[PDB]
Every structure is written in C-alpha cells, then in structure tokens.
Amino acid sequence: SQPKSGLFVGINKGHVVTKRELPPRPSDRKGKGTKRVHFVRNLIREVAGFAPYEKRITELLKVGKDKRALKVAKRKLGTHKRAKKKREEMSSVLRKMRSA
Amino acid sequence: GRMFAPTRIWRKWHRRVNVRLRRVAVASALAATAVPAIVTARGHRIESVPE
Amino acid sequence: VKHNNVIPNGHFKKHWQNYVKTWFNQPARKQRRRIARQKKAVKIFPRPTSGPLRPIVQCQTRKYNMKARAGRGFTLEELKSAGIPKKLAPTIGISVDHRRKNRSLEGMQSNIQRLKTYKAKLVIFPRRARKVKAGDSTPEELANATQVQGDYMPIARGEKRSVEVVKVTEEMKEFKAYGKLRVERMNQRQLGARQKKAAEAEKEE
RNA sequence: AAAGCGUGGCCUAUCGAUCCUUUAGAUCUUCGGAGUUUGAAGCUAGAGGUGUCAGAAAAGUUACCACAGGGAUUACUGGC
RNA sequence: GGGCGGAAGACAUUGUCAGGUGGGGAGUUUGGCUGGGGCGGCCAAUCUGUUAAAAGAUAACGCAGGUGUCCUAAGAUGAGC
RNA sequence: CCGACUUUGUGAAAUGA
RNA sequence: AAACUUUAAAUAGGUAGGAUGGCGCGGCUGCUUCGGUGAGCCGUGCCAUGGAAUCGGGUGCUCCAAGUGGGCCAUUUUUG
RNA sequence: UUGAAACACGGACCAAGGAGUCUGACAUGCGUGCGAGUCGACGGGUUCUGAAACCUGGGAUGCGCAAGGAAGCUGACGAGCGGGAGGCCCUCACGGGCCGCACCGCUGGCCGACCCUGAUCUUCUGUGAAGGGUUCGAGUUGGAGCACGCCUGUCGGGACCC
RNA sequence: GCGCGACCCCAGGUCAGGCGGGACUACCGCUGAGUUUAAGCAUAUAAAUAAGCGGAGGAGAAGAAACUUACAAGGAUUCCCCUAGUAACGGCGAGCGAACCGGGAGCAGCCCAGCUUGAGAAUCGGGCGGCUGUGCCGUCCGAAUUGUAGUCUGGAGAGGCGUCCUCAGCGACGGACCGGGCCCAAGUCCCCUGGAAAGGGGCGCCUGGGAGGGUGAGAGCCCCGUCCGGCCCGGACCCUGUCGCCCCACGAGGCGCCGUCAACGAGUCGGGUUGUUUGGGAAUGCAGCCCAAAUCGGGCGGUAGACUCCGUCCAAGGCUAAA
Ligand SMILES: C[C@@H]1C[C@@H]([C@H](O)CC2CC(=O)NC(=O)C2)C(=O)[C@@H](C)C1
Ligand SMILES: [Mg+2]
Ligand SMILES: [Mg+2]
Ligand SMILES: [Mg+2]
Ligand SMILES: [Mg+2]
Ligand SMILES: [Mg+2]
Ligand SMILES: [Mg+2]
Ligand SMILES: [Mg+2]
Ligand SMILES: [Mg+2]
Ligand SMILES: [Mg+2]
Ligand SMILES: [Mg+2]
Ligand SMILES: [Mg+2]
Ligand SMILES: [Mg+2]
Ligand SMILES: [Mg+2]
Ligand SMILES: [Mg+2]
Ligand SMILES: [Mg+2]
Ligand SMILES: [Mg+2]
Ligand SMILES: [Mg+2]
Ligand SMILES: [Mg+2]
Ligand SMILES: [Mg+2]
Ligand SMILES: [Mg+2]
Ligand SMILES: [Mg+2]
Ligand SMILES: [Mg+2]
Ligand SMILES: [Mg+2]
Ligand SMILES: [Mg+2]
Ligand SMILES: [Mg+2]
Ligand SMILES: [Mg+2]
Ligand SMILES: [Mg+2]
Ligand SMILES: [Mg+2]
Ligand SMILES: [Mg+2]
Ligand SMILES: [Mg+2]
Ligand SMILES: [Mg+2]
Ligand SMILES: [Mg+2]
Ligand SMILES: [Mg+2]
Ligand SMILES: [Mg+2]
Ligand SMILES: [Mg+2]
Ligand SMILES: [Mg+2]
Ligand SMILES: [Mg+2]
Ligand SMILES: [Mg+2]
Ligand SMILES: [Mg+2]
Ligand SMILES: [Mg+2]
Ligand SMILES: [Mg+2]
Ligand SMILES: [Mg+2]
Ligand SMILES: [Mg+2]
Ligand SMILES: [Mg+2]
Ligand SMILES: [Mg+2]
C-alpha cells in the first residue's frame, strides 16, 4: 500500500521507499471454486446424503435456533471459524430447499 | 592400570598471540639482526663479513 | 561455593567427553576445500569462478535493514523485464528465485541494472562450432575470454559516508524535533481510543 | 482554651523468607502485524505459613541384617 | 428350500478416557539437643529475675517462672478526683 | 469393580420433553 | 538472703587534655525568632611556644586467598 | 589426636610403578601488545622443509564506549570544599604564599525508577520556563578497556589417589 | 446329459527372478533405565543418554516453505561462527536452553495424480528369432479401460493468434584423474688406532639429491633410495579440447497479445482429551482414542477468546549432488 511515513517512529513508521503493486500470481486464485468441481461436489452431495450432525443442524435451523446450531456445529467441527461457516452453508442448503 | 589424569587430545596445543604482537615481535627480530654485536653474541661466526 | 565469585553455570553434567569436537583437521579442511575449488574451476573453464550472479537486496530485521547484501536470485519480474527468460537465466549463469517479491521500484531498477550490466559483459560460446545463433558471440570476442576470478560484481554493503556542509536555515532551526518525535508516539498510543471515539460517532451520531 | 501529647497497649516477650493463590491502587504497562474486547502476566502494599519457629512434603522393624566409620560414644578391665 | 447345527444377542467383548479399591507391587522417609542412645523434656522461637564475679558479652537437661493470647478500649487525649 | 464414548445395526410400545 | 537492700568498695569501664582551636569583619538561608534573634554555613584577616608523662612509623587503604571452627592445663572469681 | 614410645593403628626387607592434573566459565594479582578501541578466533589468498608462517575482512562479530525501568519508554544541560605528593615565587635562611595529580572524607548538580510540578507551545494529550525529593540505581559529573600468557581461588567435569 | 466369460482363490521341484545373514566408526527408526546432582527426596537432573530391538550407504538423514519476519523486509537442504549460557523453562531450587537476524562453507532444482487420443493403447512385459548387444528390431502371448503412455505441478498452465527466436548424431586424435613398473650425481684414493673404519689425518668430488634406512663404531660420496624428471604398460572413461561428415522445423519450446477457462493430494487437517517430549510457556512435536472438514477456501504471525483490517504461505504424494 502507500509508502511509509519516512520518520522512524509513529503510525506507519519506517523509511520511505516507493511502493510497487504486485501483479497477480497463481495461488492468488487458490481455491477459487470452479464450475466442474462445484458440479462434482454437488452431485456427490446429493448421492451420498447428509451426516447426522449435518441433519441435526438442518433441524436446528428449520426451527430457527441459530445459536444452538452454531454450538453443536462447533462441538463437532472443532473451531468457531469452521462452525460458523458450516452453519452458513447449512443455511444456504436450507434456503435453497425452501425456495421450491 | 590407568595413569593419573590420563592426557586428553583437548589440551591447549595451539596458543594465540595478538596479530599486532606478532608484528611487533618480528619487527624487533629484524631490528636486532642489524647489530653485529648481537649477531655475534647469538653464536654466528662473523669475523670476515664485510658490512 | 565459596568466596565472592560469579555464580557457577557450567553445563558439564552430561557425558560431554563423548562429544568434545576438536578441530585438528582444520588445516586439512582448508586444503581439501581449496583442491575442491581448483578442480571445480578446471571443470567449469571458462565460466566465472564466483558462480552465477546474485541480486542486491536489503537485509531484514531493524538491526540490519540498512545494509545491502547478496540474494539468492532475481525475481521473475526482473528476469522478464531484462529480456532474460525464466528457463534460460540459470543456463547463462543468472540465478532465478521464484519466491521473492519486489515491493519497490528502487530495488527492481537496481536489480535490472545488475542484469543489464551482466548481459553487457557476458560472452557465450555457440552450442556447435560454426553455427552461431542468436545470443552467441563473435569468434574474435570468444578468443579473448578468460576465467574471471573472485567477485566480478562487488555489492557495496551500505551507502558511503558523505558529510557535506549546508546552510542552517531558520525554518530548520525552528523545527522542534524532539517534540515531533514524542507527538507521534502519542499518535501511536492513542490510535485505539481515537478510532473508538470516532466509530461511535457513526454508531450514535 | 493552649502548651503540647498521639505512627497502638507504662517499658521489657506475644511471631513469619523464596515460589504459589488471593485482595487493594492508578481512569498505569505488556500480550511484540494494528486495533476494538473478555482473559492472562505485570508494578507498589497487604493476607493464606512454614512453632524443627533464617522456614524438606515423609511411620515402624530387623535377633537374618549390610557398608563407611567412631574409643568424638556404651557394656568388661584399669585410672581419678 | 442358495443358512452346517445350536445358545446368547446388538447385551457380553475389544479399544480410550473417567471415578473407587489396590502393601498384591514400586519408590522413598522415618528431625536435632542429650553427661552412650531410647523413653522423658524442649534447655530449637522467646520474656523477666538470678547465676553473670558493681561497663558490655557470658554457658550448662542451672535455678523461679512466662509466652503463641486479650483489648474500639484495657488505644489517643483533656478535665476532675 | 463401575460409567461414558466405540465396534453398534433393525423396530415396538410405555413414560419425559 | 543468688532471684533483699539505705549505704557501698578494690580491680575493671567511658570521655577530654588544642594546629580537625578561637576572635574580628561581611555575606547566604527556602530553617529559627517578637526581632540580627539564633543556628549553621560562606568569604576574608588576624592570632594560637605545639598545650600532662613515656613510647614509637603506621592496617593508613584495598585486593586475592590459605588453614582453623574437637581443645586441654594452671593461679584467682565461679555454677551442678 | 587436647595428649603417642605407647598395652592406638600401618610398617619383615629390597627394586621398580604410585597420588592436586587437563578442560569450559569467572575472579584478583602480575607481564606483554595496542588503547576508545581492541580482538583475524569462523573463512579466503598464499605457502617448494611445513597441519607452520604471512596477508586479507569489521562499515558495527564479542567485549567496551550509558544507565535506569517490570514494560511501554526515557536516557547523563558540563563541580565545589577540607587534607594532601610534587613544582614555582619571597626571605640570608628559619618561615610564608601560589598551583595543587592520586587518594580519603564532605557537600551538590545532571540522567532514569517512584513521587512531585506547570509559564508556554501543539497534531488535545503531547511538550516542559520554573521549582523540586529524610527514597531508589550495579548511574554521571574520572572515558579504560580489549587480547594473550602465568600463579592462586571457585564451580562443573572421574577431578588428589584407593 | 452341456460347452462358456469373468471374480475370488488353489496346488505346481512350472519359465525367469528378488528376500533373509555379517562388521560398528560414523548415519536412520523404535524402545528405554538407574547409580549421580539436587548436600535428605518424591517432579526435576542424570537423559529425550547407557543397555535392548531393527535399517542402509559410502556417507546417511534433510531439502525447494501451508517458512521466518514486522523489515527498506528475506527466500530450499546441510555444517562452522555469533546469536547465547541469552529468550525461555524449573520443588523459578539444583539447574537447563534452542531459535530468527548477520558472517562464512556450498549452492540445483525438479515429477507426478486430476478435466483434456477416442477417427486409434499411441504404453508396458515375457517367450521366440535377428543384429549393431547395458540395448535395438520382427512376430506370438499377456498385462491394462477399476487407465499404461502423452500434456500439466500453482513460478503456473489449457487454448487462439503472431513477425519472429531455439532444436540431430556419429566418428577421430588428445588433455585430465587412477594404478603399476624400469632408470637415473658424487672416493670406497694414501697414513694410524681398531675384530671391523662408518673414527682421526691428508687429498678430492656431488648437491633441484645432507629425508630415511642398510652395511662389523659418528658413512653426503659402499648399497637401496631421496631431487629433477624421463620411458613403457593397463584401466576407467562419458569431464572437456580441437579437428571431419552429416544441417538443424512445420512438431515442441521461448517471447508478445488476449480474455474464457484455470481441476492442486480426506478418517487427511482441525478440535477435545490422555501419555510422552520439548526451551516451547491457556499446551513444541509425536501417538492413541473420540469428535470430524473445507473451495469468496486452508495454515501461520510464540498469551487462551469474538470481530475488522493487515503480512504470509498452499499441506495431507515423490526424488535430488556439494558443503
Ligand atoms: C498453603 C500455602 C503453602 C505455602 C507455599 O505454597 C508452599 C510452597 C512454597 C515453596 O517453598 N515452594 C513450594 O513449592 C511450596 C505458602 O506460601 C503458605 C503461605 C500457605
Ligand atoms: Mg597401561
Ligand atoms: Mg555422568
Ligand atoms: Mg508527630
Ligand atoms: Mg494504657
Ligand atoms: Mg503472584
Ligand atoms: Mg503476537
Ligand atoms: Mg506473607
Ligand atoms: Mg534387632
Ligand atoms: Mg526367623
Ligand atoms: Mg574416649
Ligand atoms: Mg513398600
Ligand atoms: Mg530405602
Ligand atoms: Mg541424634
Ligand atoms: Mg542420655
Ligand atoms: Mg533454626
Ligand atoms: Mg554486667
Ligand atoms: Mg489528668
Ligand atoms: Mg550498709
Ligand atoms: Mg565486669
Ligand atoms: Mg575512668
Ligand atoms: Mg582420645
Ligand atoms: Mg600403655
Ligand atoms: Mg589394638
Ligand atoms: Mg583405625
Ligand atoms: Mg602389621
Ligand atoms: Mg620411583
Ligand atoms: Mg568492533
Ligand atoms: Mg580537591
Ligand atoms: Mg572523593
Ligand atoms: Mg578441581
Ligand atoms: Mg541426593
Ligand atoms: Mg551427598
Ligand atoms: Mg539416598
Ligand atoms: Mg534435557
Ligand atoms: Mg545403544
Ligand atoms: Mg539421501
Ligand atoms: Mg555474552
Ligand atoms: Mg675413512
Ligand atoms: Mg645411517
Ligand atoms: Mg647411489
Ligand atoms: Mg642412486
Ligand atoms: Mg519415549
Ligand atoms: Mg501435548
Ligand atoms: Mg498433556
Ligand atoms: Mg528424500
């Protein structure tokens, strides 16, 4: 981002050197979901089904108790960061199932 | 049996001297040769050497 | 222990006599390395003995940030902007480092300058005898090439000590630099409370 | 009223180190990418106690006994 | 009739945590002073008097005793007696 | 010795939600 | 009358015996006093026959470190 | 051992072997090199008897040159007295005066912890003219250290021998 | 009353092959004490050692960041120096103790699985035969569609386009390193003592050879050698040096333009708990058990936690000299 302040102390301290903007690299798209792999994962999601904790999270959301859904998702998955996004994905899967 | 306190390879075989002290010593080694009296007293036969 | 001394701290309770490392092979190490260097030079005649080129980079770490030193390789961006392809720089004696990042035009242009100088003073023999293709060099040029030895590009480690003499302007004298230095320490200490007070202005105000 | 007296008991005894926990204080410092924000460690002063009381966390037996020692030390002799 | 014949049956049981028991076993400890040591006692902290020989210091399992508390007054002070 | 998780599936009722 | 004393020895204890002393002058104080009043200090000038006997170079200052930390006898005081 | 000729232990005799060493860290004393620097110790070049020697790098490697704080952080605004070696002046000299190192004692200032303090100025929480302190520092107002060697001591190592 | 194809699995003294054991310096993996120190001792220390059980090579292991840093940032592995007896850890007691930065030694990157021949298994093996013999070719059988080969590995890449730029081998003679042999200067001159002259005395000589050994005593010169090198023989060679004939393309790569694609490793990470280990401290690694993933996603930034932003890298597959 914009260069340093030039003074050895303070907010954004250091020596002024003119900054340069780095052209994108591979692994800047690392994990960007793609059409075919979304296809593959969709299909096997439907063919295989849901795990029991996934089903219990569906039930907690179709009741609406999102705090408890997060809490059980955390106790299974292990970390808040994954629990919140598994809850987010099950909210996705439940809205896309009430859509029709 | 053993010997008392058997010698070990990690004695201090090499000693260090300050590089400037080596230079001092070699300068004072040179400066003493330029003397016929000390070259003689050190044992060399210098009685026909010209200068 | 006994009379006033520094408190002992010898780490000599394990079986250290099983792991004493004595260096009596040190001169032979030196001689072996020298023979190794000599025979590497003979095999790589007439390539420079220093090996491939290296970048000027800055050191890390506040203690050493101001001292330039040699790097591992020029980034892809330098090798591209110098007209020296990725796959071919190690071929003509220029290292390549895919991992570095350039954040400053100053570093990038300095390393371009090293690349350009090297490509000016590089001579390359043809892959075959009579077939001189692009990138090679003339026979009369090739006939005078020797094995350059030591550091054929020295990197000055830090900027030269110049202490010139200038005017002492009053706009320079009036500057309270200690007060300056304390004020942004205040800015850093208070950046928390100031932005909290600010954000609540949006929340409520 | 004042001079003054008063930093515990008329004076001589009535008591407690390190580590740890806990408490009090600044509108204090750190959590080392910058912040908000609980937690944690800090700094100064206390308490919880070591009574073997300058402060190990700790029951017996041995005639089945072992070792390094001791006449610094008993049971016999002698001596006062 | 695609079941070798029974009995138990998703309990026993295997795996891992969790609590109780565990001299069966392991490790170790089992203070000091002391007219030998053990038992006794505390002379290990510590006060007053004496010994302590008219400054101070002064020991013994010497003597006679004390202490591990009590107190918003039995602290401060002023007045009166 | 004991509890929980695990191998551990299938379905039925009675009390609790 | 060791755990009583009015009285009260002898030996032993402490301090002083000048040059690290005093007096004048003119200054400081944020202390002190009713107050140049004191207290002390500060600068300066004067004095001070060495301030009882004897004796004599000093641990005067410091560093590093050893061994020792079982005692025993005697005249006198003295506890069991 | 307080006490050995001891009725205390060891000792028949001879020959040879036989017991405070070597290493890492530190410390005082001394010698030597240089001295606000000093170390060339890991490497490189050279080396025609050489595992030696000699050269090189350091512009920040270690120690030192700056300390106080637990940490954020701040970081020495320029010293006087008493006594004193020795030098110099006056006197015929006795005696006096001046300059007075080191060292001892004394009283202060400056930096930092902790407390205290607030004219001004600024980006409003920062600066800090003035004034401080029965407190604290392994500080400062003295640059004295770096390297090697040696003896003694300490400690860890088998660590004086059994 | 059958002939079959596959799958699983048999027995084969079937054709051809690979494995076990040994040595211990160093290297890899598991296992794993205590005397001692702590002036006792019980965690700690001894020690992540000794012993035990296994695996290799001439080195082994490691190795191309799911890294450190907070910088103006660096850029695989390994070792030396300093970092540093420091941060840390510890009945915060005795004690224990690394790392980043920097300086040096040496330096090298690579290859797979996936979506991608489908007009066509283009791949591999074995038998047999031929030759130019570490292989190559012709033919048969078989493996393989539960995927061999080819392109690709995140630095990218797949495509389309482009003036353009880059591609093949075989001889010959050597040089270099390795081993071995043959040869290579000069008194044995005169006198004495002596068993012996290698000793004394005289006269001479070599020396790019006075290292050393032998020989009847202190031998440069009697012998072998040593200095200088010379001559011949034999290996491996695949390192490079110069000459000759053969001339490299419509395929691959590079460079540039594009914007559409752009697939990246699962009981794996991560979490809890338990034991061990560590300097690693609300837990450094490792392991068991249970929990159990993700694709605007995952791991780190040395204090547990929620959120906003930032820096950083892309694991769970493999190989790799030198120091
Ligand atoms: C109950 C507590 C016990 C004691 C302390 O915790 C014992 C510690 C202290 C020590 O020396 N190191 C240890 O590991 C034991 C203490 O402080 C008292 C006030 C009260
Ligand atoms: Mg022997
Ligand atoms: Mg040991
Ligand atoms: Mg008062
Ligand atoms: Mg009272
Ligand atoms: Mg605490
Ligand atoms: Mg952090
Ligand atoms: Mg306390
Ligand atoms: Mg008995
Ligand atoms: Mg019996
Ligand atoms: Mg006796
Ligand atoms: Mg037992
Ligand atoms: Mg025992
Ligand atoms: Mg006893
Ligand atoms: Mg008794
Ligand atoms: Mg005591
Ligand atoms: Mg008295
Ligand atoms: Mg009264
Ligand atoms: Mg009377
Ligand atoms: Mg008396
Ligand atoms: Mg008197
Ligand atoms: Mg005796
Ligand atoms: Mg006798
Ligand atoms: Mg006897
Ligand atoms: Mg004896
Ligand atoms: Mg005997
Ligand atoms: Mg002898
Ligand atoms: Mg330096
Ligand atoms: Mg003075
Ligand atoms: Mg002084
Ligand atoms: Mg010793
Ligand atoms: Mg012990
Ligand atoms: Mg002991
Ligand atoms: Mg023991
Ligand atoms: Mg350890
Ligand atoms: Mg072993
Ligand atoms: Mg390997
Ligand atoms: Mg150090
Ligand atoms: Mg002769
Ligand atoms: Mg000879
Ligand atoms: Mg000859
Ligand atoms: Mg010869
Ligand atoms: Mg283990
Ligand atoms: Mg763990
Ligand atoms: Mg644990
Ligand atoms: Mg490998």
Side-chain angles (χ1 to χ4, degrees):
Chain A
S1 186
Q2 306 84 315
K4 298 292 184 181
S5 50
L7 188 153
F8 183 77
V9 190
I11 295 285
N12 173 298
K13 61 185 183 182
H15 161 103
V16 295
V17 67
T18 300
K19 183 64 69 178
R20 184 178 182 271
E21 295 295 328
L22 283 71
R25 275 171 51 180
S27 67
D28 291 331
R29 284 186 55 255
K30 184 63 65 68
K32 182 63 64 68
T34 72
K35 294 182 184 293
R36 183 179 182 272
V37 173
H38 280 222
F39 185 33
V40 175
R41 183 175 291 170
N42 188 358
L43 183 63
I44 300 299
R45 181 75 275 172
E46 312 176 13
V47 176
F50 281 177
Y53 72 99
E54 293 179 353
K55 277 177 287 180
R56 172 136 55 101
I57 291 170
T58 73
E59 184 177 1
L60 277 296
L61 281 71
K62 67 183 291 294
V63 176
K65 294 186 286 185
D66 297 7
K67 184 177 179 180
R68 207 96 54 86
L70 182 63
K71 183 62 65 67
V72 65
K74 185 183 287 185
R75 179 153 83 61
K76 299 288 95 175
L77 277 296
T79 61
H80 195 75
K81 187 182 287 185
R82 297 187 180 187
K84 73 159 173 273
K85 181 266 290 181
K86 168 73 68 178
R87 182 183 59 179
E88 206 178 32
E89 155 173 328
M90 295 296 172
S91 301
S92 299
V93 176
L94 188 153
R95 67 179 180 177
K96 66 183 289 294
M97 182 179 72
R98 293 179 293 173
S99 83
Chain B
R2 289 177 289 111
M3 66 182 180
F4 163 66
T7 56
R8 303 268 184 257
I9 60 180
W10 58 86
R11 303 173 54 122
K12 292 172 71 175
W13 310 100
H14 315 282
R15 319 305 272 262
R16 216 176 78 254
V17 295
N18 304 350
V19 70
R20 194 183 180 94
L21 186 45
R22 293 193 229 97
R23 293 177 181 175
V24 163
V26 168
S28 290
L30 281 184
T33 64
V35 181
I38 296 169
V39 182
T40 301
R42 186 265 184 275
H44 297 266
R45 263 57 172 201
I46 60 171
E47 293 83 3
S48 76
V49 299
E51 173 202 3
Chain C
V1 298
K2 203 167 172 181
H3 296 89
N4 169 308
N5 297 116
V6 65
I7 298 278
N9 66 313
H11 295 50
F12 300 106
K13 300 209 172 206
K14 298 185 194 180
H15 287 72
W16 64 268
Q17 308 162 63
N18 290 318
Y19 300 100
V20 293
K21 193 167 196 54
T22 63
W23 287 62
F24 305 116
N25 61 324
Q26 186 179 33
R29 294 178 65 87
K30 181 179 183 56
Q31 291 305 116
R32 179 170 42 245
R33 290 176 172 177
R34 277 176 47 85
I35 303 143
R37 278 192 289 268
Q38 287 177 354
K39 63 178 72 175
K40 172 188 175 183
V42 179
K43 162 200 193 213
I44 72 171
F45 183 20
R47 294 178 179 90
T49 314
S50 158
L53 187 62
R54 290 182 182 271
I56 297 169
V57 306
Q58 293 304 133
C59 298
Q60 318 185 27
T61 50
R62 184 171 145 141
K63 180 171 181 172
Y64 299 107
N65 47 358
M66 73 291 291
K67 291 163 161 50
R69 64 165 175 79
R72 184 177 182 271
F74 310 148
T75 301
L76 277 296
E77 305 218 347
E78 293 83 3
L79 297 146
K80 181 175 73 175
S81 46
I84 297 169
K86 181 177 73 175
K87 291 174 70 175
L88 188 153
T91 298
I92 62 178
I94 297 169
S95 52
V96 183
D97 173 330
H98 71 264
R99 284 191 301 269
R100 292 178 65 190
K101 294 176 184 182
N102 290 318
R103 318 166 188 266
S104 66
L105 299 151
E106 275 278 0
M108 200 173 264
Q109 303 291 348
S110 162
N111 291 318
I112 300 299
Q113 177 188 345
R114 291 183 60 88
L115 280 167
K116 298 296 289 183
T117 303
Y118 184 96
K119 262 292 196 184
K121 68 180 178 67
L122 183 63
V123 65
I124 298 169
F125 300 77
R127 264 171 74 171
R128 301 265 173 227
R130 186 210 64 86
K131 305 198 208 187
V132 177
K133 302 303 154 83
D136 291 331
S137 291
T138 61
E140 295 293 326
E141 185 77 290
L142 299 163
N144 270 35
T146 47
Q147 185 174 55
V148 174
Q149 289 153 343
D151 209 340
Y152 59 90
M153 291 181 183
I155 317 159
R157 186 175 178 86
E159 183 178 1
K160 183 63 65 68
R161 276 172 226 152
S162 54
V163 298
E164 49 274 5
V165 177
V166 291
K167 197 47 172 193
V168 183
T169 79
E170 292 206 350
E171 66 182 1
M172 185 180 288
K173 292 181 181 179
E174 190 275 332
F175 184 57
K176 298 293 182 183
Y178 181 50
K180 179 67 172 177
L181 188 153
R182 292 299 295 166
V183 174
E184 292 83 4
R185 289 195 178 277
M186 182 180 72
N187 289 139
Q188 183 62 255
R189 291 189 297 271
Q190 311 284 334
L191 177 79
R194 304 161 164 261
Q195 64 84 30
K196 153 165 70 186
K197 186 180 289 293
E200 312 306 331
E202 292 86 5
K203 310 209 175 196
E204 315 160 358
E205 199 175 12

